[PDB]
Amino acid sequence: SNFGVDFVIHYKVPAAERDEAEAGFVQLIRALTTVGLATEVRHGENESLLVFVKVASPDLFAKQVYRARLGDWLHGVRVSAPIAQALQDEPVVEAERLRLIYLMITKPHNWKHVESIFPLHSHSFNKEWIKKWSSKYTLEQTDIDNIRDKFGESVAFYFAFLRSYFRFLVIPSAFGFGAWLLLGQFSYLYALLCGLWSVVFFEYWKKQEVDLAVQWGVRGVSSIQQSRPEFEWEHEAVKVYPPMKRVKTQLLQIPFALACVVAAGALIVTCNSLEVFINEVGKQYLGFLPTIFLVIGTPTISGVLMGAAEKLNAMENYATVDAHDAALIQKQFVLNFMTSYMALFFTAFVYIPFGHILHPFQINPARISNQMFYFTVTAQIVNFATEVVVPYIKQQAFQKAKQDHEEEAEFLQRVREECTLEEYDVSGDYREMVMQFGYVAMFSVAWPLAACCFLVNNWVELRSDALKIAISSRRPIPWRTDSIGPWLTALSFLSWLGSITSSAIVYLCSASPLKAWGLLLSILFAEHFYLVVQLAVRFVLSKLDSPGLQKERKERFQTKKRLLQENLGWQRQRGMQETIEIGRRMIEQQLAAG
Amino acid sequence: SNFGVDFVIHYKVPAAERDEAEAGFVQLIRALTTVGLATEVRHGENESLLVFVKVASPDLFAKQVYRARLGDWLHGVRVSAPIAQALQDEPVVEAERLRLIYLMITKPHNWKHVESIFPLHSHSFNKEWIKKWSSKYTLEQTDIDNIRDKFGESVAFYFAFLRSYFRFLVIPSAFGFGAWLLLGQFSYLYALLCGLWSVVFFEYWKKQEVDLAVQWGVRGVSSIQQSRPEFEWEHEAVKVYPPMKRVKTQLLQIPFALACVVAAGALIVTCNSLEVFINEVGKQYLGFLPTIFLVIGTPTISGVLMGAAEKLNAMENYATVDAHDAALIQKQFVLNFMTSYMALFFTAFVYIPFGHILHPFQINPARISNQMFYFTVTAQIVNFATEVVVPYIKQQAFQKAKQDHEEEAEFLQRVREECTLEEYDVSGDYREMVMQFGYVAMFSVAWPLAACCFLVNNWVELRSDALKIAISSRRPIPWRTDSIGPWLTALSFLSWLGSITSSAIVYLCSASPLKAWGLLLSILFAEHFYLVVQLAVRFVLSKLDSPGLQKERKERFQTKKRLLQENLGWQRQRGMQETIEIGRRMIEQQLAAG
Ligand SMILES: [Ca+2]
Ligand SMILES: [Ca+2]
Ligand SMILES: [Ca+2]
Ligand SMILES: [Ca+2]
């Protein structure tokens, strides 16, 4: 039970240069209290001063709610519009309570010591929520709407990308179990059910997204963009950066990908040649070490390159934040692409079909159905042990490593422990959950019992991430978006690529020489077939109008209906009898002489 | 100079059943004059009664203009909104003058003798317009906007699809002349310039369309649909037809296409075998007759099948008129597809590559560069002679075939000659102008001097159609639409198909056997390349925002801006000085003991 605290600002004051710190502290307190929010000061841990803020006069906040609530009517966020009477008719949920206060602390008014503004956690909510998700098997729609209020939309959107990827993994699980029991291995009919399913999930998601963004009322938030504060500009007109200076910096991404093809490629050369060096030249030390080299070497080489990619993203300047996450993810996607697939491509397209010709520079049948075992059993239980147990143990032994006070002796002892954690972001979870999908879309026909093991690691990741957010990471500052950023696009590229490599595989590792002809014809057939079932499920799933969408078109019409119903509410042979007389006259005149 | 007449209704009364005709005539006159428009009666020609209507009280018409002008604000046709004051601020153009009167004559109120309602022509406008288009080479944007006012939007839209297809034919003309002079015949570099150009024209058109539909203010008219009056319905809910009865009728289209593959295919078997029958077994009668068999046999076999296709479209019932032209065109497209290409496919994919194997059931090099000469010189000058000269001669000799009267002796003699003509539709012109594009998109690399002859038959068709509308067809009843109906889609299919067949051709009629390998690899490369340059010109031509579009986003904002600016216009350590005092105290308290 927090003491009504809405935010906590850190304001670290070090030993050196501490004389520009007290005046800057007064500059912080005055600028905070002119906005209209109270302040308190406690101790930190070593040299810091945890400043506590909350809103004080509820009328200024209730008008502040209105000052953006009828800002959302302006830019076409929602259609409807409600004199400070937005509290009883439709209340303020805990998204809009904590976002607008965060919009009052950082503002364009129309600081090199503040470490990190961060909200607090309510632990009376956590032991209900993490328990009640673990006694259910499925999850209802109304339980995701109980995670929107307390965390935001962009944290609540990832849990709806998981739930609607759960229940579409049950199709190629069961029809993947059949192709492990009934049909033989590497068969073509699995390579089109996995070809068909990777459009039905991808297109039923893009229709469920614009429905579920209507019901929350945040449909058009991607149209508005706001300025990132670290933007630079030479001369204003709205500000502008010289765009030809961005071409000189964006081109350095090509020596990043050129470093990416050689770095993650260097590990598989270490993996392949150490496999032979321990084979020919401790017998049980030979079969346990190339596993333990690949689980401790890979997330270090993916750490130093992504940290180099995060540095390249800040040097390449960007204007808007929506164009900032559209370039961090692409420079991070190619990095995690060549790390979690170039151990698998080189086995299936070079090692197993060309195992005769590469030999003077035999072939064993136990590698492609064994390396796919790696990325499905032992590279997930080393991941679930790392994503939860390692930070929980690292923070528990660190708690023992230490060397008005009525209830504040414990309330400071909760919030001081918070600020040494990391801010949880749903960028990394989407990057994993979009990389894991690949295996069951490109390299799945090489071992058709891959879906039925991924469906048990998404009934735990649906509650592992619910555990990680509340025991090992401070609450994310709530944001709003409509779709899953740029992830949806690079989800499409993991569909077409999955439908090509898969077709080539259903032909090589199965005509006597199996090369040139059947291979190219099979890939062309499986590619053209994809580009035809990407239209029919763009045609069946486009004549089905959603219920939500009705709530937009009616209220657009009904408001437009109500708006104008509260504001308005020569040859002259004249004589209509004269005209019909000659009409009955002329038609008999034409028929009394013929 | 017409006498203010806005429409002419025919009302043909025959010999038999003429007793239900005078009472029905009075039923016509009364229902016309209760709407509020005057009536006059003249003679017809043989048994008819040309009824003349015009609007009488300009206040009822000026409110009728408003009754749909603020109907267009309701359904989101345009954003802006102007008490019968829509005459001086923005006047009524001659589209909206003649459409609304036509919307008063046919109405849902909220007749088996009336032949055809049709507007009249102003011949003081025609001799200016057809002359002034023939003294210019190019055409300015402001001259197409002088054809919108007098004819509509859907007649004025076809002249903007021609003008922006004129000036993009100048690219593969000049770079087609080079591939006839510099480079050799059947070269691959022409097969990608024709591959690139068929996206740049197709994507620059779809961007110029939403611009030019903004400036006319008819942007969203395709969203509204209205009921076709000949619709049937069993039980209402808005009415509804049983949709499973439509599946029983729509399936009969498959025996139409199955009749289409055999009928137009039967003519080329007649073309091929009569060529040999006159070759072996009058020397100048041998080289002139297979031309004269193909120009008089083809538009008869395309007449009886399209008339069968028009009968199938009326039997298959449809609700809305927008779903009526989306099924007449598709059933007419496949008919004109297999007639103007299956004489050309069978030559280029069977005759010239497989000329050895088919021979016992030699090969000559003079057929593919001679049959492409047919569809470019002699099948256009037989078409321009048919589209203009034949109906003008047929109507001139028919004028000699005949067997209050102050100025009405000549004014009846103009309007009586009108009603025996045909109602001009821009469906057929789009069908031709979309079929002719194919030759320069699929079969163009087989004879790279095809564009430079199509660019002189579109400087005449740009004024032949301007001649046909005013000398040989009554004025079309003005309509409104935003895009070129369903033509734009089946324009896209003529792009991908053009990029495949063309790639196969650049490999067959040019490895020694030229088969299986290079062929499939070349088509795959030219198809994948297409699907990559369909993204870059969906990315360069999508970061360029149009000027028109600015006029929508500002006036949406400025109205929304103006609308709300004309209606509105605990731990308590209180004392901001107390808070900053302990703040300067604690940071020294933490640094007077360390
Ligand atoms: Ca995981
Ligand atoms: Ca994870
Ligand atoms: Ca023509
Ligand atoms: Ca024509």
Numbering used by the authors:
A (entry chain A), B (entry chain B): 16 to 97, 101 to 128, 141 to 267, 276 to 319, 324 to 403, 427 to 468, 478 to 584, 594 to 652, ...
Sentences from the paper on this structure:
The breakthrough X-ray structure of a fungal TMEM16 homologue, nhTMEM167, revealed that TMEM16 proteins are homo-dimers. Each subunit is composed of 10 transmembrane (TM) segments, with structured termini on the cytoplasmic side and featuring a polar cavity (groove) that faces the lipid membrane and serves as the permeation pathway. TM6 and TM7 also participate in the formation of the two regulatory Ca2+ binding sites located within the membrane. Our results illuminate the detailed molecular mechanism by which the lipid groove of the nhTMEM16 scramblase can rearrange from a membrane-exposed conformation to an intermediate state that is occluded from the membrane, forming an ion-conductive conformation.
Hydrophobic interactions between TM4 and TM3 that keep the groove open are strengthened by I343 and L347 in TM4, and L302 in TM3. To relate the mechanistic hypothesis to structural determinants, we used single particle cryo-EM to determine the structure of the L302A mutant reconstituted in lipid nanodiscs in the presence of 0.5 mM Ca2+, to a resolution of 4.0 Å. The predicted disruption of the interaction between TM3 and TM4 is validated by the observed increases in distance between A302 on TM3 and I343/L347 on TM4 from 3.7 to 7.4 Å and from 5.0 to 7.2 Å. This causes the repositioning of TM3, which slides upwards and away from TM5 and TM6, and of TM4, which tilts away from TM3 and TM5 and toward TM6, bringing T333 and V337 of TM4 to interact with Y439, T443, and V447 from TM6. With a minimum inner diameter > 2.9 Å, this pore is compatible with the movement of permeant monovalent cations such as Na+ or K+ while sterically precluding passage of large cations, such as NMDG+, which are not conducted by nhTMEM1624. Thus, the L302A mutant loses most of its lipid scrambling activity while maintaining significant channel function.
